[PDB]
């Protein structure tokens, strides 16, 4: 035995979520098996984690630990994606040199393997990790590869772990064009590359992203996100110029009838993360969550954590508020989890094998 037991599809008829109370519950969402694609490593950590970068470095000797995740974190939400953008460049503060990097994805993994996943594609921004102290992305990649190796090779790969490259905008140093060049230079350790950041249309990247793709680095990229955009051009660029495989969020397909139909005749998974759409207000509310409306559309989506340390959240706190406010159900969590395993960017021989031990 392991110490979780995962649920396997057969048990779920005899799970009744209505008896339970919000701990029981959560003891649920652990079990389930779930295979997560969206989730950025450089924003992946707990809140003692992160005081204890801010001590070790001595930033913040006047705050106390409280008043240091209210400084630096996104716990209590804010007004959009840039609000988010500009916090998050705060936080960069932590990247201080290679050990606390490598630190930062052992533990990444490691609280990834105790809520209950079983396939995780982190994604990072070696721009976004490099700017703050001038680091030097080959090193940082080395720390971040070398922590996860370590940590799954304690795990006896009971987690399987794949990385994804991001180019992204909105910090200094920022860099699309070297980003796309990095992936491709270390694309034995990437399995897909994305842009995040400020939401941008991408149709003017189009021939970088045309040379990652037909090296054969598959594209999913953050569109369908921000509700301040005046338009769902984002969407309709990574959908027909960059031929995305997945798209990160794209609750806004929900707003047009053309895009569902798009997504769904282009087997085009959405990478869902519903609580940083109600933190970002992107969101109105859970319960008008766009990803009832997409799923019961017929559209794949499955179901992300996005930022668990700019949110001080964690993977299961994204089953309990679709559970609790949109009526999900165990059926549909592990229908999701096997989209994700399918439309994962994994060698398909680990995710066949997988499959088979979960599914
Ligand atoms: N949900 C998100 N939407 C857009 N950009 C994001 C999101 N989460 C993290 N990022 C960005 O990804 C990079 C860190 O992985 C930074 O550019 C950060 O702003
Ligand atoms: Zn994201």
Redesign the pocket.
Same mark, same amino acid.
């Given at each position: 035995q392991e110490p979780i037991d995962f649920l396997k599809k057969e048990e779920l008829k005899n799970i009744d979520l209505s008896q339970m109370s919000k701990k029981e519950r959560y003891k649920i969402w652990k079990r389930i098996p779930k295979c997560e694609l969206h989730c950025?490593?450089?924003?992946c950590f707990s809140a003692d984690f992160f005081v204890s970068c801010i001590r070790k470095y001595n930033l913040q000797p006047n705050l106390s630990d409280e008043e240091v995740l209210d400084y630096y974190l996104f716990a209590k939400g804010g007004k959009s994606?840039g609000e988010?953008?500009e916090k998050?460049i705060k936080v960069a503060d932590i990247f201080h040199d290679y050990e606390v990097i490598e630190d930062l994805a052992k533990h990444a993994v490691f609280n990834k393997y105790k809520e209950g996943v079983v396939l995780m594609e982190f994604?990072?921004?070696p721009t976004?990790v490099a700017f703050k102290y001038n680091l030097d992305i080959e090193l940082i990649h080395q720390a971040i590869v070398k922590g996860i190796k370590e940590v799954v090779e304690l795990l006896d790969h009971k987690i399987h772990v794949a990385l994804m490259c991001?180019g =992204?905008?909105?910090?200094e140093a920022?860099n699309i064009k070297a980003s796309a060049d990095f992936c491709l230079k270390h694309k034995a350790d990437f399995v897909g590359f994305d842009h995040?950041?400020?939401?941008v249309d991408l149709k003017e990247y189009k021939e970088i992203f045309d040379y990652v793709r037909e090296s054969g680095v598959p594209l999913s990229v953050?569109a369908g996100?921000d509700v301040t955009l005046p338009n769902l051009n984002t969407l309709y660029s990574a959908i027909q110029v960059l031929k995305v495989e997945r798209i990160?969020?794209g609750i806004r397909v929900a707003e047009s009838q053309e895009l569902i139909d798009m997504v769904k005749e282009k087997n085009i998974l959405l990478e869902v993360?519903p609580i940083?759409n109600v933190l970002?207000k992107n969101a109105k509310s859970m319960d008008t969550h766009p990803i009832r409306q997409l799923y019961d559309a017929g559209v794949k989506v499955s179901v992300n954590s =996005?930022?668990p340390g700019?949110f001080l959240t964690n993977i299961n706190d994204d089953y309990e508020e679709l559970y609790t406010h949109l009526n999900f159900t165990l059926e549909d969590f592990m229908k999701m989890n096997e989209w994700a395993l399918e439309k994962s960017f994994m060698d398909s021989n680990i995710k066949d094998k997988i499959k088979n031990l979960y599914f």
């Open positions: 950025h490593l450089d924003l994606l988010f953008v998050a994604r990072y921004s976004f991001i =992204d905008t909105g910090h920022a995040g950041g400020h939401e953050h996100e990160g969020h993360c940083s970002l =996005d930022d700019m």
